[PDB]
Design a protein around this ligand. Structure first.
Ligand SMILES: Nc1ncnc2c1ncn2[C@@H]1O[C@H](COP(=O)(O)OP(=O)(O)NP(=O)(O)O)[C@@H](O)[C@H]1O
Ligand SMILES: [Mg+2]
Length: 279
């Protein structure tokens, strides 16, 4: 079971900064920079890591929000959830150190490779994401921000859930009255499924937010990505059931994808645009 943080040392190892080397800047965060580097483990093994720093002159609220992410992440030890190696708090800059994911955020990765992966490769990515979400939901953690931009992908194309800190990704009931449940994460997973099969196209493109909300409420849904297998478009539609009780559970999604992996011929049945489809 996940436990809410409103203490980081309950679920995070304090790392010795002597064991951390910084290579290069790879991103910018809400709280500071993100860089790649190396961590020397107690066993002397050296691994690649990502390193997030807390900007100099941070507020106490920024420090709490920053470390709160580590307090959450550190609760989850799963191959498809980003691994917290530890934190540095006894020296400054304060740091959160995670496993390195060479191919970065999934949405930007797929946009660089439009139509270049096999369907079975894409299904492999999606099964990873579903398996990580199955574990989070098993722990009673509702992610609320599941999106392709919040999944990281490593050198072997293994995808892992990130962003333990968005109308297009949010279920109608969560939009309507903040009803967030693992079923609203399943809705979001449906959107990620579409993002993946669309090679990182933006869900609902740049439609006015009020129109995203109204259209989905009226029963309109994102259309099948080009060359999308029928099995995968149906899974999207299933994830986007209006009635949250009718959506599949993450364990069911994992099982569906495992069958598709086992019987790749299943994927050969293909469905039938920047237009929504009624239903
Ligand atoms: N574990 C990691 N391995 C490799 N690159 C990473 C890792 N974590 C983050 N990054 C890179 O740093 C970027 C920003 O990190 P992210 O975790 O998305 O923080 P953020 O505050 O959400 N910033 P942004 O998403 O750019 O608004 C990502 O797009 C990745 O390219
Ligand atoms: Mg991000």
């Amino acid at each position: 079971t996940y436990v809410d943080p409103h203490t980081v040392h309950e679920f995070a190892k304090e790392l010795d900064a002597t064991n951390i080397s910084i290579d290069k800047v790879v991103g910018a965060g809400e709280f500071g920079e993100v860089c790649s580097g190396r961590l020397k483990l107690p066993s002397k093994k050296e691994i690649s890591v990502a390193i997030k720093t807390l900007k100099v002159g941070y507020t106490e609220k920024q420090r709490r929000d920053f470390l709160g992410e580590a307090s959450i992440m550190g609760q989850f030890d799963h191959p498809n959830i980003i691994r917290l190696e530890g934190v540095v708090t006894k020296s400054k800059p304060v740091m959160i150190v995670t496993e390195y994911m060479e191919n970065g955020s999934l949405d930007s990765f797929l946009r660089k490779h439009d139509a270049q992966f096999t369907v079975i490769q894409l299904v492999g990515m999606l099964r990873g994401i579903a398996s990580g979400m199955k574990y989070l939901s098993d722990m009673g953690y509702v992610h609320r921000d599941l999106a392709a931009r919040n999944i990281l992908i490593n050198s072997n194309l293994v995808c892992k859930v990130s962003d333990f800190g968005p109308i297009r990704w949010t279920s109608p009931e969560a939009i309507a009255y903040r009803k967030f449940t693992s079923a609203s994460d399943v809705w979001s997973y449906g959107i990620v499924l579409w993002e993946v099969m669309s090679y990182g196209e933006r869900p609902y493109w740049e439609m006015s937010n009020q129109d995203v909300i109204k259209a989905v409420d009226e029963g309109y849904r994102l259309p099948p990505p080009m060359d999308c297998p029928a099995a995968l478009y149906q899974l999207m539609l299933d994830c986007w059931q209006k009635d949250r009780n009718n959506r599949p559970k993450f364990e069911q999604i994992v099982s569906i994808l495992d069958k598709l992996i086992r019987n790749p011929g299943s994927l050969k049945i293909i469905t039938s645009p920047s237009n929504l489809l009624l239903d």
